[PDB]
Design an enzyme around this catalytic site. Sequence first.
Site, PDB file in Angstrom:
ATOM      1  N   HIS A 177      -7.594  -5.612   1.998  1.00 50.19           N
ATOM      2  CA  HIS A 177      -6.369  -4.859   1.783  1.00 50.19           C
ATOM      3  C   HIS A 177      -5.357  -5.264   2.860  1.00 50.19           C
ATOM      4  O   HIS A 177      -5.659  -5.209   4.052  1.00 50.19           O
ATOM      5  CB  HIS A 177      -6.697  -3.368   1.895  1.00 50.19           C
ATOM      6  CG  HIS A 177      -5.504  -2.466   1.864  1.00 50.19           C
ATOM      7  ND1 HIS A 177      -4.814  -2.185   0.704  1.00 50.19           N
ATOM      8  CD2 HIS A 177      -4.910  -1.744   2.844  1.00 50.19           C
ATOM      9  CE1 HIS A 177      -3.847  -1.323   0.969  1.00 50.19           C
ATOM     10  NE2 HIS A 177      -3.883  -1.040   2.260  1.00 50.19           N
ATOM     11  N   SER A 217       0.778  -1.254   0.000  1.00 49.98           N
ATOM     12  CA  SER A 217       0.000   0.000   0.000  1.00 49.98           C
ATOM     13  C   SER A 217       0.811   1.306   0.000  1.00 49.98           C
ATOM     14  O   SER A 217       1.325   1.717  -1.033  1.00 49.98           O
ATOM     15  CB  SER A 217      -0.974   0.008   1.185  1.00 49.98           C
ATOM     16  OG  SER A 217      -1.951   1.023   1.011  1.00 49.98           O
ATOM     17  N   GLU A 269      -9.611  -4.530  -2.418  1.00 48.96           N
ATOM     18  CA  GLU A 269      -8.857  -3.419  -1.839  1.00 48.96           C
ATOM     19  C   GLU A 269      -9.693  -2.378  -1.087  1.00 48.96           C
ATOM     20  O   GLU A 269      -9.245  -1.818  -0.086  1.00 48.96           O
ATOM     21  CB  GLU A 269      -8.083  -2.683  -2.944  1.00 48.96           C
ATOM     22  CG  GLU A 269      -7.096  -3.530  -3.735  1.00 48.96           C
ATOM     23  CD  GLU A 269      -5.901  -3.970  -2.909  1.00 48.96           C
ATOM     24  OE1 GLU A 269      -5.793  -3.548  -1.743  1.00 48.96           O
ATOM     25  OE2 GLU A 269      -5.064  -4.737  -3.428  1.00 48.96           O
TER      26      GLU A 269
END
Lengths: 529, 532
Positions: free
Chosen positions: B437, B197, B324
């Site tokens: 995520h 990320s 996500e």
Amino acid sequence: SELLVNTKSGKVMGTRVPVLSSHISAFLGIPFAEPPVGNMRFRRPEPKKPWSGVWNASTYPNNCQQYVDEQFPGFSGSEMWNPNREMSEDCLYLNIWVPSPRPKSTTVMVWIYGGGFYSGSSTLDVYNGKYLAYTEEVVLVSLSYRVGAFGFLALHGSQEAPGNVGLLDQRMALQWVHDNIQFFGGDPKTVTIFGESAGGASVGMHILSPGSRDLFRRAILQSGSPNCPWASVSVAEGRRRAVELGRNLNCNLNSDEELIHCLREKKPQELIDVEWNVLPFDSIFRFSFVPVIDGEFFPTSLESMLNSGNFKKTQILLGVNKDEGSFFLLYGAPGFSKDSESKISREDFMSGVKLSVPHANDLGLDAVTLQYTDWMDDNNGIKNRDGLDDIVGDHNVICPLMHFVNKYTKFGNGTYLYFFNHRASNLVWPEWMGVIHGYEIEFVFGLPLVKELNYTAEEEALSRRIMHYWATFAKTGNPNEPSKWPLFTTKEQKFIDLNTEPMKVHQRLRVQMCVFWNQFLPKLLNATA
Amino acid sequence: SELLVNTKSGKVMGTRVPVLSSHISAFLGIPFAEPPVGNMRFRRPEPKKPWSGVWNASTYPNNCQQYVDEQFPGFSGSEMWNPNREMSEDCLYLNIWVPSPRPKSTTVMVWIYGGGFYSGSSTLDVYNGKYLAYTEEVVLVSLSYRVGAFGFLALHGSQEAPGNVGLLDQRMALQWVHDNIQFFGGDPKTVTIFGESAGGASVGMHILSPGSRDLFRRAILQSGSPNCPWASVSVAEGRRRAVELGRNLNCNLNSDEELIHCLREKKPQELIDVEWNVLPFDSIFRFSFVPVIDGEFFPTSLESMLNSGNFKKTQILLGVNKDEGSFFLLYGAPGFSKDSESKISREDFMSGVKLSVPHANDLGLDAVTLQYTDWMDDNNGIKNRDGLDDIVGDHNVICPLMHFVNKYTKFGNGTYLYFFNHRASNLVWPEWMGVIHGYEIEFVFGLPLVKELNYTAEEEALSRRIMHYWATFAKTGNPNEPHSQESKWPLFTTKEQKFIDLNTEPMKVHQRLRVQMCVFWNQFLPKLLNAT
Ligand SMILES: *[C@@H]1O[C@H](CO)[C@@H](O)[C@H](O)[C@H]1NC(C)=O
Ligand SMILES: *[C@@H]1O[C@H](CO)[C@@H](O)[C@H](O)[C@H]1NC(C)=O
Ligand SMILES: *[C@@H]1O[C@H](CO)[C@@H](O)[C@H](O)[C@H]1NC(C)=O
Ligand SMILES: *[C@@H]1O[C@H](CO)[C@@H](O)[C@H](O)[C@H]1NC(C)=O
Ligand SMILES: [Cl-]
Ligand SMILES: [Cl-]
């Protein structure tokens, strides 16, 4: 006599004609207006002056002056739509088929031919009304009106060429029916007008016009609606196209009067030869001279009239064909052919959407492109072809009609919607074209009932139920005789498929694409174009 | 001694630790920079001045000062991501796991944690590097960097608050590795940087920044890329948020100098309590202090650098998780709950798209809505839930990354793309959230290999192949082991655009990861918003 009828304008003599091992009465070429010639060109129609003696009404009348399609010489697919009679400016006539014996105050159906407002004839084989009048026991009338510049040249302000005279021709034929149909056994109180494409749009326009509303009871719109993008123009655009027409013919452009005088001196064919040159863009499914939003025939914009409910409240039956756009791609888009599968490359696709949405800016073209392209297989020529076909049909027929149906149903007294998707087994056009624009017509007129036309037994069955649906609706405002054809509602939005298979009820005809064409694209163009 | 290492800054003493029946050496909390305290807050890092004696590197260091999530108290699903050590501004340390016996010149992998640039810690249980270092025989390093205002307050022009200092912290950790890793058995010439990320965005930024390029061989980006809509801001937006921060603290706003001085006298927690108030609009997946396109760390616009090929040309392995956006919908969008199926009404769907695409005008909102709505069934709460989920994931992660992968590949020396879509069997989050995520991380770090964690046997196998792909790639620039029987992860090429699915099932090769939606997000929407 049964063939001798006395009308308010004079006597007329019809002819007994054969129809499916039997016969009915037919009155062909009845005048409902004075010939629009000479000084009459571009002017509102005038009631036909009463004649003495008997009017010979045994043969079809002349067809109006019009552009003639020569793309495929000898080809029956295209030739069946061309004038089958001499062309003349003296063309305002109507035809009537009456059941034999002559009925008593029976339902009247008035046909209005399509042809993009630049063509059409009431005498085509497919418009023969003997099978429908006979089979369904209704009095069938087919009218005519001026097309092209002759019926739609619009110089707003002027009284010599006010625009919409072609619609006024239609209105006068309706007024004539209202005044004389009773002598043919027809009920002027139960008249149903119906037409395909420009004919369907015409029907819708009469529904919106205050001056036409009391001339009919119910309406049927086949593949056409008043709000279609090609069906009308503003007074300003009408004027520039008129001026441009004069420019093309070296006319005096100092004043409407001089321009008009100049145009009235030209031979019909001269006007027609340049008709297409006044269009503002390279495009497809766009015609030069069409109805104008003048504030006279149409009180206000078509949209505002739909929203405020300012239109005739009655029952309507309408629908569209599965592949409305193929015909126009074949005639004006690159990559298409009548003799091949017409696989469309990526390049031709892009050219195609430009031609299909002429008024769109680049962001608008990207939106259309995105909405119709499968990016997991953008080079698939079949998908590109079918994608283009959907774009033309959705944007020009299907979605504008759905917008109309939803607006109308808020105030209407009954809506019946259909989706015709049967490909005739004897079609002469290539497979890729699918269920072509206008081919549901032969089923409405019952051509599948004549054996020498080589239709299948299931097609003849379909035709019979379509004719029965049309006629029953015309007689009662409901296509069902007490599988029910669901009433389309604001909530459910049901509609039926029209094919050889058992009736299926669906909901929200192409709602995804129509949200795009009716709500998103318009909003995008108003904010960026 | 295997645990006593002498570095260019002084001697360090590591510890021996147990790992899957064997042992490995670990050096925890090795400082690589001077404490960014007092007059140094907001300043570029400074090299850790040499110390005398032995630095005890047997315990984890402190975690940087950061916002702490308290949405679900006691809940392990969210708490596993919170600081598990005391927070301090004195936080620039790194950790190292070295195979035992010590390798000679082995591959080195440097982990960069994520957390939207406003959080993260190198000491989390999921980042325990002993399993991967041991299993793949690599030297594993986990670095740290300042987050939030502390690492990204940006007052362009100033030398006290330049911005991007957190990225510079990262670079300094990389420089330290470049200069000292050889003393731990690692090869400075073969270092792979990888992060998830915000960490993924960081990795791509070092690939873009000229001053970082020579500090590593290749890179792995997990669910994140430099061009993400939330990963950076312009100098102007950066200044606006820095000033708005001072305003929130009744600071002297007459000059950067006083503003900075004012901000430097505030306690850490004070800045953090107001951090979120400087955002432009109500939104989800948007963070206050992130990198800035300054013309320094980044010569020019991210888009121009990508188009010109102005970046490090090497091999990259990257990818995304199937869902996500679920995490962010749960925390900030109406209708979402971790205790229900979270069926969304059309009303909340609309509110959801506005939150998700905060910069879009009404026309932009309508385009997004039409693009993710099935109009034959617009009241289906499930379809609306998943539609919004896709919107968040596509806009913020998947499409920005595909944009990056396609641009990079025009100049790169090898691209490998994956799609992680395996829902962990022991996941404590609700099913509607899918493949969340960051939950691919535990597979990357071999957590499934420790039996007390209760992962399935098929998940252990997935973890082992993922660690092998990752390590083999770091060692050779190719996730595949030459002429082997196992299925092969194909190169992603500009023409075929292949990628693989990463799950417990046999490998499946696919093409054009979400092209349809990415054409909309990467090409169409930007044009629509740019129109007017
Ligand atoms: C009507 O005109 C046609 C010629 O078109 C002719 O054959 C027919 O006999 C005429 N009818 C009468 C009785 O005048
Ligand atoms: C049509 O009008 C009648 C008379 O007011 C009304 O009772 C009926 O419900 C209407 N039908 C529809 C479908 O609107
Ligand atoms: C280093 O710190 C650890 C943790 O408290 C301790 O066990 C160890 O004895 C320390 N080593 C030295 C030399 O102080
Ligand atoms: C990487 O670069 C080498 C030479 O520098 C070249 O031979 C090779 O084909 C490149 N690999 C790829 C997949 O681009
Ligand atoms: Cl016959
Ligand atoms: Cl263990």
